[PDB]
Amino acid sequence: LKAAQKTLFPLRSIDDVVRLFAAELGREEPDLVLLSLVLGFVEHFLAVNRVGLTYFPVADLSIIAALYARFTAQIRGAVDLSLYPREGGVSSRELVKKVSDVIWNSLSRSYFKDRAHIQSLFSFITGTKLDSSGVAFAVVGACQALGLRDVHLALSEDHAWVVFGPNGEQTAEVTWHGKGNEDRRGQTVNAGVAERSWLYLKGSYMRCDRKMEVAFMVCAINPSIDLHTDSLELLQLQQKLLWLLYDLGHLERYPMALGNLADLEELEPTPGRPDPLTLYHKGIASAKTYYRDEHIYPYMYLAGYHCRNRNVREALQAWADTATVIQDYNYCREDEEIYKEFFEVANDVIPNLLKEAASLLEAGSQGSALQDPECFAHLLRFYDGICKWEEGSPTPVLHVGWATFLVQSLGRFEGQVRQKVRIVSVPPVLTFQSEKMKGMKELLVATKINSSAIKLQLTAQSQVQMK
Numbered sequence: 001l002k003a004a005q006k007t008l009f010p011l012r013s014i015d016d017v018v019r020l021f022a023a024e025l026g027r028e029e030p031d032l033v034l035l036s037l038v039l040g041f042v043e044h045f046l047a048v049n050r051v052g053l054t055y056f057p058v059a060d061l062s063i064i065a066a067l068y069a070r071f072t073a074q075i076r077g078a079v080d081l082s083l084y085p086r087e088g089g090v091s092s093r094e095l096v097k098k099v100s101d102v103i104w105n106s107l108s109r110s111y112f113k114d115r116a117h118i119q120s121l122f123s124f125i126t127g128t129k130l131d132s133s134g135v136a137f138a139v140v141g142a143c144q145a146l147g148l149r150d151v152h153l154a155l156s157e158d159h160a161w162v163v164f165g166p167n168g169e170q171t172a173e174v175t176w177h178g179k180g181n182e183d184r185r186g187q188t189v190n191a192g193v194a195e196r197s198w199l200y201l202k203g204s205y206m207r208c209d210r211k212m213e214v215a216f217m218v219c220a221i222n223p224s225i226d227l228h229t230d231s232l233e234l235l236q237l238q239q240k241l242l243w244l245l246y247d248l249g250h251l252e253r254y255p256m257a258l259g260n261l262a263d264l265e266e267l268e269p270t271p272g273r274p275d276p277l278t279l280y281h282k283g284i285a286s287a288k289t290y291y292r293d294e295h296i297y298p299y300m301y302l303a304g305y306h307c308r309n310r311n312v313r314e315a316l317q318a319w320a321d322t323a324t325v326i327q328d329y330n331y332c333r334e335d336e337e338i339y340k341e342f343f344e345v346a347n348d349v350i351p352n353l354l355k356e357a358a359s360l361l362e363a364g365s366q367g368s369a370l371q372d373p374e375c376f377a378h379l380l381r382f383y384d385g386i387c388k389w390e391e392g393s394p395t396p397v398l399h400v401g402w403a404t405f406l407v408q409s410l411g412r413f414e415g416q417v418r419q420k421v422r423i424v425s426v427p428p429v430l431t432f433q434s435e436k437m438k439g440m441k442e443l444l445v446a447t448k449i450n451s452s453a454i455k456l457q458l459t460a461q462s463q464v465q466m467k
């Protein structure tokens with residue numbers, strides 16, 4: 001560490017950690033290794049082991065500098081730069097692979113790879129454990145420590161890798177995804193881009209600078225103590241650090257970070273700040289501006305907020321927007337995480353919401369989503385996008401389990417409401433993009449819902465029971 005990096009120690013409070021991040025973010029290049037070690041230290045003593053806690057776990061320079069020295073020694077010792085000449089101030093694929101191998105080979109042979117609190121360089125050093133995206137971050141921090149200014153973190157909505165090389169144009173896989181089913185470690189991401197999978201976002205993934213890599217580690221803070229309890233101290237630290245990054249402009253290209261900040265503000269609003277809704281909409285605006293509106297989670301963040309607040313109209317609208325994004329992807333083998341999200345929304349969340357709305361309608365609610373044809377249109381647009389998604393995909397999406405819930409959900413709206421939606425062809429008003437929903441149009445607006453016909457149309461089940 002440089003002398004100027006050490007003057008704020010010891011860190012005795014949340015605000016002292018914020019000052020450290022402010023100082024680093026004002027430097028030429030913030031020190032990723034220093035910052036991740038500090039966050040992991042304070043997370044360990046606020047969420048993993050709170051024995052002896054009286055206010056805040058004091059981070060002494062001697063402790064942090066020793067951890068820092070362990071990391072930099074491990075990397076500099078195992079990676080000999082002389083073997084990998086750098087032509088052009090840029091790194092080679094072999095060098096990036098070597099750094100990835102060094103991180104990988106340091107990890108415990110067996111552990112639960114989905115645990116909490118294994119995201120930081122603190123976990124790497126003290127526990128020899130990292131989660132999937134934690135390995136990618138560690139590769140980037142190791143590269144920074146080695147002076148490899150061109151190596152940066154790349155992020156989709158469910159995976160992480162690195163960019164590097166001439167113009168920062170090369171990609172390399174450096175960690176596992178999911179079960180570790182495939183690998184492609186060391187290869188480009190271009191096959192996944194070319195297949196139009198959600199996992200690689202059609203190439204509209206995040207290419208971090210150093211400041212966005214700091215935002216990533218802040219988003220990566222895990223306040224959870226257990227399944228029922230969060231650390232207030234860590235929630236506050238994450239919130240204050242996210243506001244710092246926001247004010248400095250470093251969340252401009254980070255949609256999900258804005259959703260995280262909005263969620264924190266909902267829990268505990270900061271005087272004189274934008275409201276959660278404004279922040280969710282900035283997240284969506286970031287995705288439209290920088291990522292061709294090809295991201296799903298900005299709309300999911302918004303929908304969840306509306307769901308929690310029982311704004312059924314606005315929740316349905318946001319979900320219909322999630323589907324309007326997914327429809328221009330192919331559903332591929334490693335996209336299971338976003339299938340799980342759509343599944344739970346269609347087959348659990350929406351049914352719960354509409355069941356409650358039905359009871360409230362019985363009790364005399366006015367302005368009910370169930371009496372609003374625009375709400376029925378949103379529901380139909382949601383299913384349309386899912387059906388369009390499935391078109392031309394190498395693996396199907398829909399099955400009869402989905403059909404039971406679609407029929408139930410349609411039935412929550414009376415015929416007099418459903419009949420008000422106008423479904424218009426290309427070449428409330430809605431246009432369907434999917435052939436499935438186009439074929440379902442007359443069934444949707446009929447006084448009595450034909451369940452079996454709907455099932456057949458949604459699943460493209462050819463035949464009905466013989467006997």
Ligand SMILES: CNc1nc(NC2CCN(Cc3ccc4c(cc(C#N)n4C[C@H](C)N4CCN(S(C)(=O)=O)CC4)c3C)CC2)c2cc(CC(F)(F)F)sc2n1
Pocket residue numbers: 133155156157158159160219256257260297300301303304305307308341344345349
């Ligand atoms: C913040 N930075 C960041 N975050 C990353 N990933 C985040 C993606 C969002 N999740 C939280 C999450 C999960 C599911 C969500 C939602 C929202 C919805 C909806 N509807 N849904 C659907 C589900 C079914 N329900 C709906 C009902 N609600 S409720 C009870 O509240 O009403 C709960 C959630 C959210 C917000 C947290 C993690 C990532 C990932 C990266 C790639 C890599 F590899 F690094 F991991 S970078 C990154 N950055």
